[PDB]
Design a binder for this molecule. Structure first.
Ligand SMILES: Nc1nc2c(ncn2[C@H]2C[C@H](O)[C@@H](COP(=O)(O)OP(=O)(O)OP(=O)(O)O)O2)c(=O)[nH]1
Ligand SMILES: [Ca+2]
Ligand SMILES: [Ca+2]
Ligand SMILES: [Ca+2]
Ligand SMILES: [Ca+2]
Ligand SMILES: [Ca+2]
Length: 901
DNA sequence: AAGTAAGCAGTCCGCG
DNA sequence: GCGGACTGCTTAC
């Protein structure tokens, strides 16, 4: 097999590499890598190396990496560009793997671990590590085993061994319900003392040294805790055995609020699953406890135990250990679904970076572009410092607030990356500038044509047309991968809808789910067998389809994020190819494109309706348009349609056969106007939206920019079994809005769009009457809590103190004295509730850590003093008033003449 | 980490 | 009470 790296490090003048050799074995080597860098040289000097602008360079081979780094410094002293890849490990990887890496994940040791630390005096700080580690569960992907290290004797209590027999039993048998499918995979090791446990853990670690190291909060908790505990007991040399090269750095993570310590383990790639989830999931959660996320992702119930965690080991060691094991398994289950480790490996190996570098789009693109240029013997420019400067972004149309009955939406496929490719925007393709007219003059095609030679953006920039830049070349490659996975995702989605339909008529039989590939549209034969399946088999198939869709979603949306990150990186001062001329060329072209096409669509539709000056485009944001289809439906007449699906078909056909070709003609003209390299503006239909045929539903409404709701029947070619709401920006979509309130607001919107005013009024009346019964957590607001200290003045709110910060201070006074009450963590999220006048907490609100029940000593008082009136007005009535006034609808029945009977 | 546009909650204080 | 200037937070792209 082809060799591939596992990890790479620079340690002084050596590269330390762990890799998989041609026989599939893991090896480690130390290489005295001699790096090269480059200087510009005279034209007369024959060379094969040129910079991205075609200027000749001479290669400088250094005796070692320190000599190279020192040369960079002196070149700065002289004031001359030191060219080439200054991150020597990236150059090493490029030299050593000069081919597209094919990796075999089965050979990569992925370790998932979690530790337990009993602490009677509050949160056990990892920098101090003053308490024994009393449990470690460490799952190894190569062994497929959960290794459990269990401390039986501690100053905080001596306990009996954990029983695998009890662990397996149902909770109704007094057991722990450790999943039957992992029971046989547990290797249990009890220990008489902590020193023995830790020495054995280190020997185990030496034998089975993680390449990828993950778990939940491992970077901020488990890793530094383990490192520091071993350090305290045994000394530094022993703690450094966590690194395969015995090298560690105590690194600081800091922005503007504070600072925390992480331990860099050289020769390991730490991918903390909480950080993976935050970067790759495209959710924003009210809480990031593993309990919370596991429930959301897997629909598993929280791990329930009596009493505080600080007393769980002594009261119920059995459950304490079982929950440690289950916690490790839950992360594996989340990854089986989301496939973020697979994603990281794919992207890391593609770019030829340390795998942990996938968290940095800048590093990722730097490596991609370097490898691409190196292929042509081209030499990358030196990174420079730039002052941060603001620059313009997208255009967003101001909508008229209203209901909108029939709506069709369109938007550009991968807008910013397509603009880069179309215009040929790249550091080395800049050809010059032209005299810019106001943007509206381009939008209306009255400005002079910018260039008869070069490809232009309306910001004044011109680009070469003879050859693609490296940015367009490399962005195209990742775009094509994105396109492939999105195809699989959408096929799985369509397949899901087929199954949902068949579930209306399940057969009474005993049968099996079909063995199919959900990434491909079901054939006619498959569809026929589906119509004969039992509900049990159909539900299992639906589960499998939806898992396939999620896998496709992960693969596609993160590749989209990477390519959109390249467009953004051009406006990031840390990027090697930072250039506000290019960043603004993209965004300004985007503004033109949207407004140009708005004009064209209006012109087209006014022509097919025989009107003049009518605005068919009601809204647009960045690269999208929303077209009112009322007049199209009305031209045939509502009564001519058999059912909802009939007019949906008709609008789909109209969009595809009339609108899209007209859109395409408009964009081809724009391409010629800007003299662009290649027409790549592909604005395809997104949504077909409207009320159910014959109903009083309003179909949709806008309240303002980035705030709307549509009742959708078809989304990018997926025809839903049941209509689905597309809601953007409204409170139903915000993590800050109480859970029960999102739900209730969503139902109000459903009723408005699908059923109408009377239905809305009926629901509102019920919600208002019943809502006081809702669980306090379900009606609490949520906020991030930054800068708690700044606004704290002797335990009381300082000037300008934000409402949620006020609530935290209230909480802090109420739990003062307690070492054991949960502390609010700076930068984490809190639940927030308003408090009625004259409450014993002495302020108008209280906040506590999100994802948790408020501590028992104050819980009863919070419940008693919760201000339900304020909560309802602020989170429910105020937003609902906004939705209904925009939609010209009343949520409460107004008096009428009929009342007099 | 370090793409911009833009919405709403809340504080502070003016607005005769 | 609403509105602007402002901070804070959170979305839509
Ligand atoms: N830097 C950055 N830019 C973004 C992000 N989301 C959207 N944009 C910019 C770049 C996009 O091309 C543009 C249009 O946004 P869309 O959400 O419609 O995405 P795009 O058109 O790229 O992909 P699509 O094919 O519509 O799924 O807005 C983001 O998360 N980061
Ligand atoms: Ca735990
Ligand atoms: Ca788009
Ligand atoms: Ca599309
Ligand atoms: Ca059937
Ligand atoms: Ca869009």
């Amino acid at each position: 097999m082809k060799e591939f790296y596992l990890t790479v490090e620079q340690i002084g003048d050596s590269i330390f590499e762990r890799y998989i050799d041609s026989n599939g074995r893991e090896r480690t080597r130390e290489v005295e890598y001699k790096p090269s860098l480059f200087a510009h040289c005279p034209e007369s000097q024959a060379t094969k190396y040129f910079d991205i602008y075609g200027k000749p360079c001479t290669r400088k081979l250094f005796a070692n990496m320190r000599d190279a780094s020192q040369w960079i410094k002196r070149m700065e002293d002289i004031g001359l560009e030191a060219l080439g890849m200054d991150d020597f490990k990236l150059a090493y990887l490029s030299d050593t793997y000069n081919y597209e890496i094919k990796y075999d994940h089965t050979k990569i040791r992925v370790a998932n671990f979690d530790i337990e630390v009993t602490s009677p005096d509050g949160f056990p700080e990892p920098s101090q590590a003053k308490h024994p580690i009393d449990a470690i569960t460490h799952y190894d992907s190569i062994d497929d085993r959960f290794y459990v290290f269990d401390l039986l004797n501690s100053p905080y209590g001596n306990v009996e061994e954990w029983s695998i027999e009890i662990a397996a039993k149902l909770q109704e048998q007094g057991g722990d319900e450790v999943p039957s499918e992992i029971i046989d995979k547990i290797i249990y090791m009890p220990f008489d003392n902590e020193k023995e446990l830790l020495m054995e853990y280190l020997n185990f670690w030496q034998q089975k040294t993680p390449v990828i190291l993950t778990g939940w909060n491992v970077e901020s908790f488990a890793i530094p805790y383990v490192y520091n505990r071993i350090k305290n007991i045994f000394g530094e040399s022993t703690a450094k055995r966590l690194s395969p090269h015995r090298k560690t750095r105590v690194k600081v993570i800091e922005n503007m609020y504070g600072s925390r310590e992480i331990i860099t383990l050289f020769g390991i790639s730490v991918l903390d699953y909480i950080d993976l989830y935050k970067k790759f999931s495209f959710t924003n959660q009210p809480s990031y406890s593993l309990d919370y996320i596991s429930e959301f992702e897997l629909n598993v119930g929280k791990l329930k135990y009596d009493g505080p965690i600080s007393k769980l080991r002594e009261s119920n060691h059995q459950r304490y250990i079982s929950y440690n094991i289950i916690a490790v398994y839950r992360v594996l289950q989340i990854d089986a679904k989301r496939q973020f480790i697979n994603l990281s490996l794919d992207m890391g190996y593609y770019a030829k970076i340390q795998i942990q570098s996938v968290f940095s789009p800048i590093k990722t693109w730097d490596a991609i572009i370097f490898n691409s240029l190196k292929e042509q013997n081209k030499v990358i420019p030196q990174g420079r410092s730039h002052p941060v400067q603001p620059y313009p972004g997208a255009f967003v149309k101001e909508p008229i607030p209203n209901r909108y009955k029939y709506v069709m939406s369109f938007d550009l496929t991968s807008a910013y990356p397509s603009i880069i490719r179309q215009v040929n925007i790249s550091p080395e393709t800049i050809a010059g500038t032209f005299k810019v007219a106001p943007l509206h003059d381009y939008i209306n095609a009255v400005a002079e044509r910018p260039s008869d030679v070069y490809s232009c953006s309306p910001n004044g920039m011109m680009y070469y047309k003879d050859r693609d830049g490296v940015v367009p070349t490399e962005i195209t490659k990742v775009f094509n991968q994105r396109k492939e996975h999105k195809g699989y995702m959408l096929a799985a989605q369509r397949n899901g809808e087929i199954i949902k339909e068949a579930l209306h008529n399940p057969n009474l039989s005993v049968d099996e789910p079909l063995d199919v590939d959900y990434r491909f549209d079901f054939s006619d034969e498959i569809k026929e067998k589906i119509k004969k399946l039992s509900a049990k088999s159909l539900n299992e198939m639906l589960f499998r389809a939806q898992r396939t869709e999620v896998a496709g979603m992960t693969a596609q949306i993160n590749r989209k994020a990477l390519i959109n990150g390249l467009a953004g990186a051009l406006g990031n001062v840390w990027f090697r190819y930072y250039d506000l001329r290019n960043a603004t060329a993209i965004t300004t072209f985007g503004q033109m494109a949207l407004q140009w096409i708005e004009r064209k669509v209006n012109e087209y539709l006014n022509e097919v309706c025989g009107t003049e000056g009518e605005a068919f485009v009601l809204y647009g944001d960045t690269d999208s348009i929303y077209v009112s289809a009322d007049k199209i439906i009305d031209k045939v007449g509502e009564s001519k349609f058999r059912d909802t699906n009939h007019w949906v078909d008709f609008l789909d056909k109209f969009a595809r056969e009339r609108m899209e070709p007209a859109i395409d003609r408009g964009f081809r003209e724009m391409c010629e106007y800007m003299n662009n390299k290649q027409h790549l503006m592909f604005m395809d239909r997104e949504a077909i939206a409207g009320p159910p045929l014959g109903s009083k539903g309003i179909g949709g409404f806008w309240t303002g920019k980035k705030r709307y709701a549509l009742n959708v029947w078809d989304m990018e070619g997926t025809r839903y079994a049941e209509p689905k709401l597309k809601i953007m920006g409204l409170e139903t979509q915000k993590s800050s809005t109480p859970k029960a309130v999102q739900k209730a607001l969503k139902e109000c919107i459903r009723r408005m769009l699908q059923e109408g005013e009377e239905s809305l009024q009926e629901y509102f009346k019920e919600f208002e009457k019943e809502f006081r019964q809702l669980n306090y957590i379900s009606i609490a607001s949520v906020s991030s809590a930054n800068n708690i200290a700044k606004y704290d003045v002797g335990g009381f709110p300082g000037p300008k103190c934000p409402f949620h910060i006020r609530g935290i201070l209230t909480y802090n006074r109420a739990i003062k004295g307690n070492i054991d009450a949960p502390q609010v963590v700076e930068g984490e999220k809190v639940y927030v509730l308003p408090l009625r006048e004259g409450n014993p907490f002495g302020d108008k609100c209280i906040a506590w850590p999100s994802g948790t029940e408020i501590t028992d000593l104050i819980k009863d008082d919070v419940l008693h003093w919760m201000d339900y009136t304020v909560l309802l007005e602020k989170t429910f009535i105020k937003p609902l008033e906004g939705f209904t006034s925009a939609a010209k609808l009343d949520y409460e029945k107004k008096a009428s003449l009929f009342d007099m009977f």
